[PDB]
């Protein structure tokens, strides 16, 4: 049922201001990934964004249709992020119910005006997902959840989907190294903050291309700490748990900076 898997950035910078060549390339890579997701003909898109924060129980988006205009609290000067996100209410709801059956208390969030994160929104815009053709099952990034639990959380969502006989595309939304610049830069001068973040970003990406699940699995915690990876790289664990710890390899369609942070677009070969 999992027909394709992708990692995309959470940063809105590539969508908002793609005239910046570097950010522009990332945008195209994300757009291309969306073309690959669509060709996989899924019934749903299993989405985790590093910027969708839960602190109590796990949250699943259960609102049939969420629309509005999001303004990023960091990147507001670069523009507005309009959105019209369709959720697969049946599947999301099933993920709500199954979660405690796997030792994770969960709830659905169905509220007009609920603050859907920048990651989800920009992924939907750039990939063409959260449409009625490609509805979403979004699972919160619970700050108290580890890589371990994040996988357990993706695996049950895939199983819930399998249960409803639905072809799933899994999307892990988030950055790489997170050494954001701490003063205003010229956007045209954006680059990975330091060479060590780049070496790590490139090393782990190479490990992702190779499908070396094992070497990656032990590289991740050190990568997260040393490169300041977006939310402990848990958007990756989400991919891993959904694929059930197994994938052939990957094709990195894009890699570049987002205010000093790293960002990549990865297409997973199941």
């Amino acid at each position: 049922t999992v027909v394709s898997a992708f990692l995309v950035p959470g940063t809105p910078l590539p969508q908002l201001k793609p005239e910046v060549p570097s950010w522009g390339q990332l945008a195209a890579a994300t757009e291309r990934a969306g073309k690959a997701l669509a060709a996989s003909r899924p019934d749903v898109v299993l989405v985790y964004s590093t910027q969708w924060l839960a602190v109590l129980d796990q949250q699943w988006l259960t609102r049939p249709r969420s629309e509005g205009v999001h303004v990023d609290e960091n990147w507001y000067e670069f523009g507005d992020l309009a959105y019209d996100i369709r959720a697969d209410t049946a599947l999301a709801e099933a993920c709500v119910t199954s979660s405690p059956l796997h030792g994770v208390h969960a709830r659905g969030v169905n509220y007009d005006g609920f603050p859907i994160d920048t990651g989800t929104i920009t992924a939907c815009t750039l990939m063409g997902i959260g449409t009625d053709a490609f509805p979403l099952v979004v699972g919160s990034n619970n700050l108290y959840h580890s890589g371990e639990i994040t996988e357990k959380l993706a695996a049950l969502a895939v199983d819930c989907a399998k249960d409803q006989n639905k072809r799933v595309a899994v999307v892990g939304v988030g950055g790489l190294s997170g050494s954001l610049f701490r003063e205003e830069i010229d956007p045209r001068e954006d680059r990975i903050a330091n060479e060590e973040d780049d070496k790590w970003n490139r090393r782990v990406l190479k490990l992702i291309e190779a499908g070396d699940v094992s070497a990656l699995r032990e590289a991740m915690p050190v990568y997260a700490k040393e490169a300041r990876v977006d939310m402990g790289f848990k958007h990756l664990h989400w991919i891993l748990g959904a694929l059930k710890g197994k994938f052939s390899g990957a094709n990195v369609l894009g890699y570049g900076p987002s205010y000093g942070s790293g960002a990549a677009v990865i297409e997973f070969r199941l």
Binding site: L53, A54, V55, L56, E73, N74, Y111, D112, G113, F114, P115, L180, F181, R182, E183, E184, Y259
Partner: peptide, 23 residues
């Protein structure tokens, strides 16, 4: 209102909207 790049200040005369607590 968390910001990475420095310290931000509300700078438009009027602001409004529906504030839903995420948690």
């Amino acid at each position: 209102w968390i910001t990475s790049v420095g310290h931000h200040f509300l700078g438009v005369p009027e602001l409004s909207g529906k504030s839903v607590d995420p948690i």
